Subunit: 322 residues, 6 copies
C-alpha cells in the first residue's frame, strides 16, 4: 500500500520516454525497487514484501515490449521472494532487495562494456556502419572499434517518429567518429556503401526474432538483400522467456501526437487514423549474429540463452504475484 | 536576351519545390514557355526563337531528376524549332509555341485521368492500398477506384524529409477515402495487411528501373518479399530517352536543412554530414506493372515505349541548343 | 431471336465441361457460329446479324476464364460486323460468318502443330518432363519430341478435382511415351528428377502472367526453386487483350460437387464451405518461355503479341454488341 | 515364439492405415506390447523377454517413416531390457512392460494437450489458418485457440491420395470452427488470405527437416514465398535419433491403388507407373517454429532435443535385438 | 570446287583458337569469303556461287557456339544469293561478295567502338569492375570509361582453361588501367568490393540468356547475390536467330588437353574423364543490361532485336544451301 | 632455447605447403612437439617447458587460417602446462608432451574414419558428387560410400591455383571411383547433374560459416541455387574457439607466383597486382550439414560444439605463453 514517490516518478518517466532505451529502463526499475526498500517505513517483513510486489507491478505496467524491464524486476524479486518465503526478517529482506538491484545494475553496466569489446572485433579498419535508433549496446560496439584505432564512419538513420537518431549522431560525433545522417527511407539507397549494420534490441524471442525500434526490419531486409552483415548488440536480459512457451510479444502503440504534433493533428479529419507502432519484428533469417556479453551466437541459439538462464522460472508464476 | 517575369518565378518555384510533382512541374514548365511566347515583344522570328531557347535553358536548369520537365520542353521546342527552321514568320512561330504547350498541358491532364481508369481495374473491393509520397497519377487510381464504389483504405506514408504524405492523406480523406497514416519505417510491419502498392514515377529508365521519391525502393523491396503487387502509375513522358544510350539519371541531393532545420543544424558538430537524396532507384524485378495512359506494361517494356515515342530525337541535339 | 439447337448444345457442353480445353472450346464456339449461319432461315441481312449477335452472347456466357473463347468469337464476329456494316447482302454475310469460323478452326489446328514443332526443339534426349492437367498444346510438344526419337518420360499430375491428368496419362501412353503418374502434392518431391516442366494456358496477360489449371502456379514455384525450365505451350489466341487496359481476369469458381460428390457432401455440416477455383495465376518471374505458333518469347513479351495483333480492337466495343 | 492376437491385429491395422497418425500408431504400438505382457502365459523372465522382443519386431516392421512408432517401442523395451538384464523375476518384468507402456501412452496424451496450449498463444484472433492432412497435434492448437474465443477459420486441404482432410474438416466443424475445404492444388492461390500455417510431423531430423504428409513441402515453400508463419506441432518422440549419425529416413511408397482404384488401374497401359510416396521432406528454412510439449523451438534446435533426450542410446543396439 | 588456301588457313586457325573472340572470328570468316571472291579463278557466275557456298560450309563447321560466325556468313551470302537469283553476271556477283564482306567488317568495328561509348556512361568514377575472359566489346566499355578520366580498376579473372584473362590483363594495363588479377574461384570473395560487372557474349538467345565463356554464369549469379550490375556488351550479330523457333545453342566441348597437358594426361587412368565445356548459359534474370550498338536493352528484349533484324530469314534455308 | 631440427623442418614444409590439408598440418605440429620432447637435451623441467613454448610459437606462425593447427598445439600445451604448474618433474613433463601429441594424432585419424561412416549414410546409390580441393574428411565420406557398394561418380574441380583437384582425382580413381574432372568455372554448368556436394573445412566459426579453399563459397552458392545438399566434413578441431568472442578469421594471402609463375610474372607490368587468397568464407545459410566425428549438425550448432569443447579455455591466455 505505501509506495515511495521515486517509484511513481520512474514509472511516469518510463511511460513518457523521458527515460528510454531497453537497458536503461531496466536499470531504472531495479533502482526504483532499491529506493523503495531503502526508504521503506515497514516493521514486518510481510509489509515490505507487499510494497515491493506493488512497486514491481507499477513498474511492470509502464511499457510492454522491452523484456529487459520485466527481467530486471524478476532479477530482484525472485531473490526477494525466496528470502521472504525462507523466513528472513525485515532487514535481511531489505538488504536482499537492495543488493539484488545493485547486482543487476552492475551486471548491466559490465555487459554493455563486454558487448562492446566483443562486437568491436568484427569491425574492420575503414568500415562504414549503418545503425538505427539509439542503442547503448550498439554504440558500445562502434565506440570501442574507434578507440582501437579503426577509422570508421557511421550512417545514422534519424529514426522517426521520436528522432532518437539525433541522440546517436551527437553521441558518436562527440567521440570523434564521423557520421552520415539520413532519413529512414534512404537506408536502401545507402546500403551499397555500407559494410556492416549494427543495431540493438528490446526483446529477442525463442526462435531468434529481434523486436527493436520501428524500421529495424526494413534495414535488415535490404541488408540481407545486399549481403551486409546485420549484427544485433544485446544483453542476455533482452531475451524473452515467455516466448519459449508460445507467448507473442506485444508491440507498443504509442500516441499519434508523436507522429503529428497535437496543434496540427486536431485540424485533420476524423477519417485519417495515425498509427504509431514503436517496434517491429525482424526475422532471424535477416540477422547474422547476436552479440551478448557471453559471446557471438547465431540468432537461432536464442533458445539456448533462454534455456540455460530463464527456463527454470516458467513453472512458477511471476515473482511479484500473490 | 529579354525573358518574362513568369519564366523566372516558375523556375524558382520549381527549385524551392513550391511547385512540385513530376507531372505538375512539367505542365508548369510548358505553361511558362507559353507565357514567354504570349508576352514576348520580339518583332522577328530569330529574336523569339532566341527568347524561347533561353527560357527553356533556365527551366531545364532547375531540378534534374524528373525527366518529365525536359520532355515537356522538348515537346514545345521540337515543334518550335521545326517551324522556325522551316521558315515560319513571327506569328506562326508564336502560335506554334503557345499551342504546342497547350497540347502538352491538355495531354498531361487527360493522360492522368486515363491512368486512373486503367489502374483502378487492377484494384478490388476491400483492398488496402499502401502508397508513398504524393503522386497525382497514383492518386488518380485510388480516387477512381473509390468512385467505382470499391471500399478501399489507403495506408499513406508520411514521406520524409518533406512530408508530402500529409498532402496525400488530406487529399484522399477529403474525397471520402479512409486513410491510415504511418511513418516510412512502418512499411514492412504493415505490408502483411496491404493488398496493393500504388506509387508514382519521376523517371523510368530503358531497362525498366523507376526513379521515384526516396524510400520507394524499400517499399517495393518488401512488397516483393510479401507478394504484394507493386503498381507504378506513370505518364509516358515520365520515361527517359537518354537512358537508351547509357545515361545514368542524376539523383537530386537537396539541402541538409530539409532534414535538420537551420536553427538546429548550426549547433551540430562539424563531423556529422547530413545527406538528403530526393529519389532512389527501384529495380524492375520489384515492379509488377507500370500503368501508362496507353495501358499496362511490364516494366521491361519501357524500352518499347521509348523506342516508339522518343527514339528518333537522340541523333539530334536538344531543341534549345546552339 | 431464332437460334439453332447446336448453339445451345455447345453452350451446355462447354458449361458442363463435356467439351473442355481452352483451345477446343474456342474451336467449338467458332463451329457453333458456323452452323448458326449455315442453317439460318433469315431473309434480311439485319436478321442474320441479329442471330449471330445472340449466339455469340450465348457462347460468351458459358465459361469466363479462358480468353481463347471470346477471341474465337471475335475472330468471326469482327469480320461479320464489318461485312454487315459495309452493306453485304444475306449470302455474302452468311459466307463471311462460315468462312471466318473455318479460318479460325484451321488456324487453331496449324498453330497447335507448329507449337509442337517449336517446343520439341527444347526437349533433349533423356528428358523427364512434368506436366499438369491436359493441354493439347503441351501434349503436341511432348508428342513431337518423342517422334523425333528422344527417349522422354512424362510425370503426369492427376490434376484434381476433375482428374484430367488421367486423360493426359492415357493419351501419352498411347503414343508410346512412358508416364509416371502422381498426385498434385508430390510435385515438389519429384522436381529434383525433372528436367523440364511444360504446361498449357487458358489466358495470358499483358504483364506476362499465365492463368492455367488450378495448381499450375505451385508447380512453377517449385520448378523455379529448382532451376527447372517452365515452358508454357500456348497459341496467340490464349493472349488476353482486355488486360492491356487494366482488366483483371475472372477466376472461375466451379461447383463444390466436383470436389466432394453430391451424395457425400449433403451429409457435411453447414459450417464447411467447399471452394473450387478452376484456375490460378502464375507470375511471369516463374515462367522461362511461352511457346506460341510464332515462336519462343519470354513472358514479358506477352504485351508485344497483344499489341501487334489485338490492340486495334480495344477502342471499339465488342463485335457482338448492339 | 507365442504372440498374442492383439499384436498381429494392431500390426496389420497400422499397415492398412486403419489406425493412422504418427502419434496414434505409437500409442497403438505401446498398447500392443502392453496387451502381450498382460496376457502372456510365460512362466519365466527369459521366455517373456523373448515374447516382447518378437512382438516389437513385428510392430516395427509395419510402416517405416514415422519414427514415433519405434520411439514408443524403445520407450517400453529400453526399460524392459534394463529390468531383465538386471535380474528381474517374471512379475517384475511383466509390470515393467505394462507400466512403461502406460507411461508412454499417458505422456503422449499429455504432450498433445500441452502442444495445443503453447501453439495457441501463437494464434491471434481473426486468423485464417491453413492446415494439411489430419494431425492431432495441429488440431490441438487450432481447437485450443478456438476454445480461447479467437474467431478463427481453417483452410483444410483434402490431402490426396488418402483424403485425411475429410477427417480434419468434419472434426474441426464439429468443435464449431468454420472450415474452408480446398484441393491441395489451391494452396498457393489461397496463401494470400492465410495468416498462419499449422501442420504436424512424422519424423524430425537432426538438421531440422520435417518429414510429414506428401504435399507438406509445397505448402511450406509457398508459405515462405508469402511470409506466412509455418508452425509444425510435434511431440518430442517425433524426433529422429538415428538422423544424428547420418541416417536418411526412408519414405514410404504405398500401393498404386490408393491413387488409381484397382477397377480402373488394371485397364491402364503398362507404360504408366503410378508412384505414391506417403511423405515428403520440408527443409528447415521453410519452417518458422516446431512446437513441442517442452516449448517453441527453431527447427535447427532439433539437434538439441535429440542430444538431450535420445543421444545416449546410439552406442547401443535396439532394445529388441539379439 | 576450287577453294583458296586462305579459306582453309582461316578455318584451321579458328578450330585451333589461334584466332578467337566471337566478333574477331566473325570478321575472319567474312575476310576469307572476301579473299575467295578476290582470288577466284571462276569463269562463270555458277562457278563462283558454288565456290562460296562451299567456303561458307567450311567456315560454319569450325566452332558451333558463337553465332557471330554464321551471322557474318549470312550477311554476305544472303546478298550473294540475291544477286545470283536475280541473274547477276560474274563481276557483279564477285563484287557483291567483296563489298558485303567489307560492309560487315566495317560495321563490326563501328558497333564495338559504339558499345564502348554507350557502356562507358554506366561506368562511374571510382568504379571497380569485374570482367571475365577477353571480350573486345567489354574491353571497349572499360577503355572508353578510362579515357573519359574516370579512375577505375578492373578485376580480371584468369579464365581457365585457356588463360584468356592474361590477354585482358596485359591489354588493360597497356592502356594505363590498373588491373587486379585473380583465379576464377575468387569471384565471390571479391564481389563485395566490385561495383559493376562487364562481360561479353558469344550468342544471345530469344528469351535473353547469354552464352559466354565457361564461368560467366557463376560470376553473374554471385553478382546478382550482392546486387552488382551485370552488363553484357554485345553487338547485334551475337543475337541467335535460330532460337526464336526453339533451337538450343550447342555448347562446344574442346580438347581435354587444354585442361590437362598431354605429357601429364596420358599418365592419368582411364576412369578419370576430363570435361572441357567452353561456354555456359547465363539466365536473363542475372543480367541487368545488354549493351548493343543501338542501345541499352533489358535482357528480355533480345527477342525485339531478333524479330526486327533476323526474323525475316527463318522461313528460308541457309544462304549457302541448295 | 635448443629447438630440434624436426620442428624447423616441419614449419618450413607447412609454409611452403609441401605438407598441407587442415588435419594433416595439425597432426604434423603435434608430431613435431612430440619430437622436441623425445630428442630434448633439457636437464631441468623449466628448460623443457621453455623449449616447447618456443616450438609452439614457431609452429603457430606458419599458416594462420586453418585453426586445426593451433587447436592441436593447445591440446598438447594445455596438458603440458597443467603438468608444469602442478609441479611435475622432468620425465613426467616430457611424457605428458609425448602422450598428448600421440593422443591427438590417434584421435584425428579416428575422427576422419568416423566422419566417413557418418557421411556415407547420406550418399545414396547412383549419386553424383561434386567436391573441391583435396579434403581427407570429404574423401573419407566418398570412399566409404563406394566401399558400401554405392555406384557414385565424383566431379573434382581442379582447384586453382595450387591444383589440388589433381591430388583428389588420382586419389579417388585409385580406389576405383569414376571421376569427372573440370575447371573451377564449370561448377554451375554441372550443378544441374550434381546430387550432393561434399567439401572440407579449415575453420568453422561460431555462427556456422565455413572457411575453406578459395572457391568453396561459389560452389556452395550455386549448390543452394539448384537445391543440392552441401555437406561439410569437418573434425571438431576445425571449429574456431576465438570466434565465440568476436574474432575474425584471417584469410591467408599467398605468393602471387602460385598464380603466375616467376618467369612470366616478372615480365608483366607493375600496374597489374595479382591477389591470391587461399580461402573464402561460406555463410551458414548455404550449408545444409556439417559432419563431425560426433554427428550431423546444422551449421547453426557450430556454437554448441565450441561451447561444450573449447569454451572453458577462452578466459586463459594461450598455453604456450608467459
Ligand atoms: N510477430 C511476432 N513474431 C514473433 C514473435 N516471437 C517470435 N516471432 C517469430 O518472428 C517471425 C516474424 O516473421 P515475419 O512475420 O516478420 O515475416 C515469425 O517466424 C515468428 O514465428 C512475437 O512475439 N511476435
Ligand atoms: N490475379 C491476377 N493477377 C494478374 C492478372 N493480370 C495480370 N496479373 C499479374 O499477375 C501477378 C500475380 O502475382 P501473384 O499475386 O500470384 O504473386 C501480378 O503481378 C499481377 O500484376 C489478373 O487478371 N489477375
Ligand atoms: N541451356 C540453354 N538454355 C537456354 C538456351 N536458350 C535459352 N535458354 C534459357 O536459358 C535459361 C537457363 O537457365 P538455367 O537452367 O541455367 O538456370 C532458361 O531461361 C532457358 O529457358 C539454350 O540454347 N540452352
Ligand atoms: N568474413 C568473415 N565472415 C565471418 C567470420 N566469422 C563469421 N563470419 C560470418 O560469415 C558470413 C559471411 O557471409 P558473406 O558476407 O560472405 O555473405 C556472415 O554470416 C558473417 O557474420 C570471419 O572470420 N570472417
Ligand atoms: O507526377 P506525379 O505522379 O504527381 O508524381 C510523380 C513523383 O514526383 C514527385 O517528386 P517531387 O515531390 O517533385 O520531388 C514524387 O516523387 C512523385 O511520386
Ligand atoms: K499482404
Ligand atoms: K498471407
Amino acid at each position: 500500500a505505501m509506495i515511495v514517490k521515486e517509484v511513481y516518478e520512474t514509472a511516469e518517466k518510463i511511460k513518457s520516454m523521458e527515460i528510454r532505451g531497453a537497458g536503461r529502463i531496466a536499470r531504472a526499475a531495479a533502482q526504483a525497487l532499491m529506493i523503495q526498500a531503502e526508504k521503506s517505513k515497514a516493521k514486518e517483513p510481510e509489509e515490505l514484501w507487499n510494497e515491493l510486489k506493488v512497486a514491481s507491478k507499477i513498474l511492470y505496467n509502464t511499457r510492454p515490449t522491452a523484456v529487459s524491464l520485466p527481467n530486471a524486476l524478476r532479477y530482484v524479486m525472485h531473490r526477494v521472494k525466496a528470502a521472504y518465503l525462507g523466513g528472513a526478517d525485515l532487514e535481511t529482506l531489505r538488504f536482499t532487495a537492495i543488493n539484488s538491484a545493485k547486482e543487476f545494475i552492475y551486471n548491466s553496466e559490465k555487459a554493455i562494456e563486454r558487448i562492446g569489446e566483443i562486437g568491436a572485433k568484427r569491425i574492420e579498419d575503414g568500415d562504414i556502419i549503418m545503425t538505427h535508433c539509439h542503442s547503448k549496446a550498439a554504440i558500445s560496439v562502434m565506440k570501442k572499434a574507434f578507440e582501437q584505432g579503426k577509422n570508421i564512419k557511421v550512417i545514422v538513420t534519424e529514426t522517426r517518429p521520436k528522432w532518437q537518431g539525433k541522440i546517436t549522431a551527437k553521441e558518436l560525433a562527440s567521440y570523434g567518429i564521423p557520421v552520415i545522417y539520413i532519413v529512414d527511407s534512404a537506408a536502401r539507397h545507402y546500403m551499397k556503401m555500407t559494410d556492416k549494420v549494427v543495431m540493438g534490441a528490446n526483446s529477442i524471442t525463442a526462435n531468434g526474432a529481434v523486436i527493436n525500434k520501428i524500421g529495424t526490419s526494413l534495414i535488415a531486409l535490404t541488408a540481407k538483400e545486399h549481403r551486409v552483415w546485420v549484427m544485433i548488440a544485446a544483453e542476455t536480459y533482452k531475451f524473452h522467456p515467455a516466448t519459449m512457451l508460445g507467448q507473442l510479444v506485444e508491440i507498443e502503440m504509442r500516441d499519434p501526437t508523436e507522429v503529428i504534433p497535437e496543434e496540427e493533428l486536431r485540424t485533420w479529419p476524423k477519417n485519417i487514423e495515425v498509427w504509431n507502432p514503436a517496434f517491429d519484428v525482424t526475422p532471424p533469417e535477416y540477422i547474422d549474429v547476436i552479440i551478448t556479453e557471453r559471446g557471438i551466437i547465431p540468432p537461432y541459439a536464442a533458445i539456448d540463452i533462454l534455456k540455460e538462464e530463464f527456463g527454470w522460472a516458467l513453472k512458477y508464476k511471476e515473482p511479484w504475484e500473490d
